[PDB]
Paper text:
Cation-chloride cotransporters (CCC) are central to the regulation of intracellular Cl− concentration and have key physiological roles in neuronal excitability, trans-epithelial salt and water movement, and regulation of cell volume. The CCCs are strictly electroneutral transporters, NKCCs transporting two Cl− ions coupled to the movement of one Na+ and one K+, whereas NCC and KCC couple the movement of one Cl− ion and either Na+ or K+ respectively. All CCCs are feedback-regulated by the concentration of intracellular Cl−—this is mediated by the WNK (kinase with no lysine)-SPAK/OSR1 (SPS1-related proline/alanine-rich kinase/oxidative stress-responsive kinase 1) signaling pathway. Here, using single-particle cryo-electron microscopy (cryo-EM), we report the structures of human [name] (hNKCC1a) and mouse [name] (mKCC2a) at 3.5 and 3.8 Å resolution, respectively.
The [name] structure is in a similar inward-open inactive state but with an inhibitory N-terminus peptide in place to block the translocation pore, and with a very different dimer architecture compared to KCC1—together these exciting structures allow us to propose models for the regulatory mechanisms of CCCs and to gain insight into the defects in known human mutations. In the case of [name], using mass spectrometry we confirmed phosphorylation at the two sites in the C terminus (T929 and T1029) whose phosphorylation appears necessary and possibly sufficient to inactivate KCC transport function; additional evidence will be seen below from the blocked pore in the [name] structure. Within the TM region of [name], we noted a helix-loop density that we were able to assign to residues 85–108 in the N terminus, lying in a cleft between TMs 1, 5, 6, and 8. Residues T92 and Q96 from the N terminus interact with R443 and S444 from TM6b, while the additional N-terminus residues N93 and E102 interact with Q524 and R538 from TM8. The presence of this bound N-terminus peptide is a marked finding since at this position it is expected to completely inhibit function: in addition to the inhibitory interactions with critical TMs 6 and 8, the peptide completely blocks access to the otherwise-inward-open pore. Compared with wild-type [name], a mutant with deletion of residues 85–120 in the N terminus was found to have increased transporter activity, strongly supporting an inhibitory role of this N-terminal region in KCC transporters. At the extracellular end, E224 from TM3 interacts with R142 from TM1b to prevent access from the extracellular side congruent with the apparent gate in hKCC139 and above in hNKCC1. Furthermore, analogous to the intracellular essential residues of hNKCC1, R193 from ICL1 of [name] is close to D539 in TM8, forming a polar interaction, and from sequence conservation, it appears that all the CCC transporters utilize this interaction.
Numbering used by the authors:
A (entry chain B), B (entry chain A): 85 to 108, 119 to 236, 242 to 336, 366 to 497, 508 to 683, 693 to 844, 848 to 872, 876 to 886, ...
């Protein structure tokens, strides 16, 4: 049989995910459209929507229906955005949200959706026997102005039918498997019946009114007359008159005003007159109003009729595509119901005084070809039985995963699915919602749970897009993060409109399970608890993943003692504890023989590191050769994207001292290593006589043609720690003075002067490098506030001492040559006291604060 | 002069921090106690506190004063906790909070405190000319039932005096330096005067009442009589009578009930009688009430009289100790004012009908030896002038640091401190608070700003203690994080009691500067912006800083290709993407010559790593020798506390094949390296024939006497990925079967059997190791759910094949011997198909889920 064979509305659950994953059909969109439509036409269309049309303006209830439509369509867009970033495995919406958001939003969404559905199981079981006591045969339990006796009347019948359909769901769930299609017919025939009844628009059951009252005609069947026969009659009930209008009009209503009664008698708008001035506290045959009916009390009664869209994707796996059927079988399925709730709210501009909630001559809607008062019974029974079976099967899915540890008992089952203890708990926490025993006070409770469940989805699917989580890539139309952010804001606003003093409490509870799952999850994988949390956060911040962040290469003395703490005193003030600093070292060979040496060395360097007030990490490597215990730090510094950008090192002071030292072959191989690794180098020459604690009271930099721009960030970073003047000294072989002055003034950096120096001959030059630098520069904008200049090696001229010997000096090193490394060791320390030779890499974009 | 020489109440600020830090006195506690007391006795004690005693119950206003006392004392405890974890440098409270919390809470506290003080400058300038228009000579600006003409009256005089003391603060701030002591006398003489007046308790200025009315005696000076002379008189104003009580009683009041008027006439509690039933909408000589006076409207009018405690530490640096004077000069200074507000609220149980706000015969308090109506003028002038000078000096301190980038203009000054544009902005945003022009509506605005400023301090100083930030160690009595958490909760509750729809808005604004400072701060130090944020978060989560987190040692083929992806398929299912996994490799030498080899190798291994669904980091090291390119990974794996706990490696398959291979000396040196590094080892023997994607359908472990407990975590981790049975097989040479069965059942792990095997001889044994393990075990509890057992090497018996050849096998390796490493290569692969040899370290606590 095409269609009706193998069709339900109940969700998939836990067992049909276990089967789909252990052993590792094909319904169309029409099997995921109709279940989204079946459980969304609930009970607030048949017996409370016309009261919303009556006890509020049509131009206010239109805005109510529109904003409650947008509040859930803008979340079904996020359901479209979640159904494409993965393989949409099996089970209901819970496994989708869990495997697409981690366990942490999955628990906080699943518990709120469970608390929503387990009060849906109360709100529909409480409105399915109002029909018995108001429209079918009354079987009440007792008079004399008793308005709270109906409360105790409805409690016992509600508890009886709750035990009835909690029994019939435990045994014989194949029965509600079988009856899954007639519950759709009982909705759709009744709604087509009332559209046909509006299309008739001819007849009316008339009412009977007083002068400006309602005169509820339960037993007053004398047809609006005090006395009319051959002799007079009693009709004992008077004050002014008694007319008889016809309520079910068809031509024109113009009921576009808000008439909010407050526990008083109903009144037609200017029928004849009114003439009294006294107390009117009688209890006679008149139709009163139940409670006050302001706006924010009414939106929380309307909102449970637009809920259940994530139960429109509970049929996963059994689809054939499941990545197009979930969006187009929900957005169409929410639009085809929004069309009903918007056309019907203005298409009830035919009745007159539909503000009476219960009855005037005992009829609910009365605009159809008496069908609706039994079609709206099996519909409400089925929508209260779907929310009964579905709710324990969600506790089984939450408890099965071990996401919550004290949810251990509730994954028991009876030999094939069929949750047992979860049905007991949902019966208890539905029973504590049935003792409230009024349909208008369980709706702002149920509404708030579905609002926070819809709000956490929009909060998650907009923060996964900003914070680029790796397994988060949606493949659907729209679903932009601004749209889900508007969904967040709209769901949060409609949460605080309903009841804010419950919104804060039930959001701080739902924002507290999200930390408890994080504690019990960060304990399982790291084994520590309070450290694994911080540790896990570091792992996520690395997996989700200019200014110099450096590795400093100090060496250790004959003991486990550092040899030049002035280098640490220079790197503390170059960087000021703002960034990444790896402080490495290297020892002799064979870790077996020397691990106490490295232990005491890292203890000493960690003692030094906090004394100079620098925040970083130490790594001490034991290696056989001294060279490849440095080239095994440069290649492997930080862990992930925390790569060191540059390497700082001291000059080899005792060069050419020993006979076969080979400690400067180490240095030249280091320079070639750092340059061919695309990495910058900072070598300090006279490592002693650098200031530590003591302050000072003219930093001079020497722009050679290469590697500039880095030459002016470093004094710009040094002056923030203990402040002198600075002298830019460029070299050339004209108009660049004005360009450099405008560049230094456009940054408004400091009091930097400028001197133009022209040298006929200066080595370390190559013209085919700016064309290699511009290929990387163009691969990266407008408003370029960066320094771009248009226009045997002796190096014994050395004009950089005629205006020098004042303060810290900076220069560019020449490029390394190959053989003849001893000829590369030219030393520019003819008279320079302290100097820090720099050498940049290739890719150095220095845009802001250069 | 001892005392009065060099004493102010104004805060320190920006310039006197710059001077204290560029050039790098001695007042006692009495110079930090009295400034905390001077600006806390504001204007709501003299002209609105008695209205709170009158228009609310004394047993409700007592609870009001008590909870507003606790709300700020429980924050001054956090001010004690912040004043000891550092060196309390200079400036006001802003530099303390900034340097002790980072810039991020510092900006969000400084802006809220600035917005609090700049409306203090309005609330005191608006209540300093109510005294002119109600108690001094009226100079009003126009009658005939005009209650809003007083509003427009007060606006122009308030704007005039605001321009007056905004002018006199810009030029001649040495004048308010000079007058800083008389403003304390004008408080303390007046409050001692009213205590002396209560100590008198003898006399009274009497009033004149109607039957049950107040009869405001502005011009009705006929002394409560209709006509009394030799002839009658008019007194034209009647209804019932006119008595004349005496208000200022002394014996007994018993006014302990809440009498909340709502825009009606005042009425004594049962004076004589009342006799009328009609409309009473006249405007005659009677004292009416201004507005409704419910409780949460009144706590937000009382709260601006307990504010200003962080201006009790604005005198930093100029103290001599500053680490004991700040707590004991604030807690005593808040207790000595709480004592006043609690004794005075029950010590106004002497007056009668003090519910009239403005005047009955033109007197404010009238319980002193007329002094108070001028002592409460200079006090309010000084407390409105302190909040004028202080507020721009705080914008200078916020703008100077560059914490906020668009606050660039407001650090201008005039040649020595003296902020100029900040005074213009605080004049404008005080002027938009003076146009509200009512003292009772600028107080729930000002109150909310000081409440969120007090709430962020309690939020910061309780999260710095849980999350162990390194430069956060307080050294003061109490200051426990539960106490500051109660401060958080109490400040948040008193925030939402006042005005919740402004609480959410002005908390989402103050929770939005905290992210803008984080964006503009994480851009300055990392240069990237959106990545530096995540990067910075990783750095903080590492600096703030059992289950195996492993480094796997794969090797690369003749190309840049991996050689055994089954090892990655084993480490994907051993760990399931939950933890840290470093996937290392090693190549030939000389990085210069081989960096494209390492580039393509890490590209290939990163291609493989995501294909097996394992989340980790790859590091590829080029080194000359193949050995110390492995021992330079084991010593330096992860960056900080993300150290790899164990090393996984494949067995050398082609052992003893080449003539001089020396690839197994590598392996034995690896085993000695890993054991003497206190690190665990996992070596897979037959690396091919391990399952990848395909599932399976009897894991057997072999407990040798050493290193157990780890032997049962690994199958317990393997079965969560694709599920067979398991066989525990221990060895001995009795009662341990029952102990092992109770241990395996107490964890309720799986269907593990148990076989006891006894061998007469088995090598790799030493008895003096459990005494070395128990020294580490005792250094770590109760309810020990861990496995603790009480009771030429041949290795050719090999009884581990009589019940074997089924599934994955696990064993303990023997300890390495020294020479004769080729004799250590005994192979237990007589018939075992797949086997993963394990070897633990020393420190393996395996408490939960073993």
């Amino acid at each position: 049989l095409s269609g009706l064979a193998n069709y339900t509305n109940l969700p998939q659950g836990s067992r049909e995910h276990e089967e789909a994953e252990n052993n590792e059909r094909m319904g169309t969109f029409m099997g995921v459209y109709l279940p989204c439509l079946q459980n969304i036409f609930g009970v607030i269309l048949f017996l409370r929507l016309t009261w919303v049309v009556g006890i509020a303006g049509i131009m206010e209830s239109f805005c109510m229906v529109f904003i409650c439509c947008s509040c859930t369509m803008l979340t079904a867009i996020s359901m479209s955005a979640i159904a494409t970033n993965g393989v949409v495995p099996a089970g209901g919406s819970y496994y989708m949200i869990s495997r697409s958001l981690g366990p942490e939003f999955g628990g906080a969404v699943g518990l709120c959706f469970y608390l929503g559905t387990t009060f849906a199981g109360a709100m529909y079981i409480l409105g399915t026997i109002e029909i018995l006591l108001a429209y079918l045969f009354p079987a009440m339990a007792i008079a004399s102005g008793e308005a709270a006796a109906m409360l105790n009347n409805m409690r016992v019948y509600g508890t009886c039918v709750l035990t009835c359909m909690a029994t019939v769901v435990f045994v014989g769930v194949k029965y509600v498997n079988k009856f899954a299609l007639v519950f759709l017919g009982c909705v759709i025939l009744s709604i087509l019946a009332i559209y046909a009844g509006v299309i008739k628009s001819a007849f009316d059951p008339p009412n009977f009114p007083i002068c400006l009252l309602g005169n509820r005609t339960l037993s007053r069947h004398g047809f609006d007359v005090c006395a009319k026969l051959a002799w007079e009659g009693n009709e004992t009930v008077i004050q002014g008159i008694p007319g008889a209008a016809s309520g079910l009009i068809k031509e024109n209503l113009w009921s576009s005003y808000l008439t909010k009664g407050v526990i008083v008698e109903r009144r037609g708008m200017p029928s004849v007159g009114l003439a009294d001035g006294t107390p009117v506290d009688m209890d006679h045959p008149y139709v009163f109003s139940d409670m006050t009916s302001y706006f924010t009390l009414l939106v929380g009664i309307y909102f449970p009729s637009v809920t259940g869209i994530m139960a429109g994707s509970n049929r996963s796996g059994d689809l054939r595509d499941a990545q197009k059927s979930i969006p187009t079988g929900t957005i169409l399925a929410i639009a085809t119901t929004s069309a009903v709730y918007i056309s019907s709210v203005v298409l009830f501009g035919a009745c007159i005084e539909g503000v009476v909630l219960r009855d005037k001559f005992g009829e609910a809607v009365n605009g159809n070809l008496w069908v609706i008062v039994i079609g709206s019974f099996f519909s409400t029974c089925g929508a209260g039985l779907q929310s009964l079976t579905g709710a324990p099967r969600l506790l089984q899915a939450i408890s099965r995963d071990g996401i919550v540890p004290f949810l251990q008992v509730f994954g028991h089952g009876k030999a094939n699915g069929e949750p047992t203890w979860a049905l007991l708990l949902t019966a208890c926490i539905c029973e504590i919602g049935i003792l409230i025993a009024s349909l208008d006070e369980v709706a702002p409770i149920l509404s708030m749970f579905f609002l926070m469940c819809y709000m956490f989805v929009n909060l998650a699917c907009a923060v996964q897009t900003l914070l680029r989580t790796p397994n988060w890539r949606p493949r659907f139309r729209y679903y932009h993060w601004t749209l889900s952010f508007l969904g967040m804001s709209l769901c949060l606003a409609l949460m605080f409109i309903c009841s804010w003093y419950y919104a804060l409490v039930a959001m701080l509870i739902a924002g507290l399970i999200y930390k408890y799952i994080e504690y019990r999850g960060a304990e399982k994988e790291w084994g520590d608890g309070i450290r694994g949390l911080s540790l896990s956060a570091a792992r996520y911040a690395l997996l989700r993943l200019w200014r110099p962040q450096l590795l400093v290469l100090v060496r250790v003395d004959q003991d486990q003692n550092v040899v030049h703490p002035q280098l640490l005193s220079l790197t503390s003030q170059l960087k000021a504890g703002k960034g990444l600093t790896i402080v490495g070292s290297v020892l002799e060979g064979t870790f077996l023989d020397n691990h106490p040496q490295a232990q005491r060395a890292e203890e000493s360097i960690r003692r030094l590191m906090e004394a100079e007030k620098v925040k970083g990490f130490c790594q001490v490597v034991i290696s056989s050769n001294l060279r490849d215990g440095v080239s095994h730090l440069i290649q492997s510094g930080g862990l992930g994207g925390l790569q060191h950008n540059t390497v700082l090192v001291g000059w080899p002071r005792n060069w050419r001292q020993k006979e076969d030292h080979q400690t400067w072959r180490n240095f030249i191989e280091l320079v070639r290593e750092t340059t061919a690794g695309h990495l910058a180098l900072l070598v300090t020459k006279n490592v002693s006589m650098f200031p530590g604690n003591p302050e000072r009271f003219s930093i001079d930099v020497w722009w050679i043609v290469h590697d500039g721009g880095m030459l002016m960030l470093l004094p710009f970073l040094l002056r923030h720690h203990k402040k002198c003047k600075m002298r830019i000294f460029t070299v050339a072989q004209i108009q660049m003075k004005k360009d450099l002055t405008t560049f230094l003034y456009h940054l408004r950096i400091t009091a930097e002067v400028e001197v133009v120096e022209m040298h006929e001959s200066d080595i370390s030059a190559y013209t085919y490098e700016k064309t290699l630098v511009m290929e990387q520069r163009s691969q990266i904008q407008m408003h370029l506030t960066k320094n771009e200049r248009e226009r045997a090696v002796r190096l014994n001229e050395v004009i950089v001492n005629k205006s020098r010997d004042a303060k810290l000096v900076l220069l560019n090193m020449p490029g390394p040559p190959d053989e003849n490394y001893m000829e590369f060791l030219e030393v520019l320390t003819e008279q320079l006291d302290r100097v820090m030779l720099v050498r940049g890499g290739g890719r150095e974009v220095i845009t802001i604060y250069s």
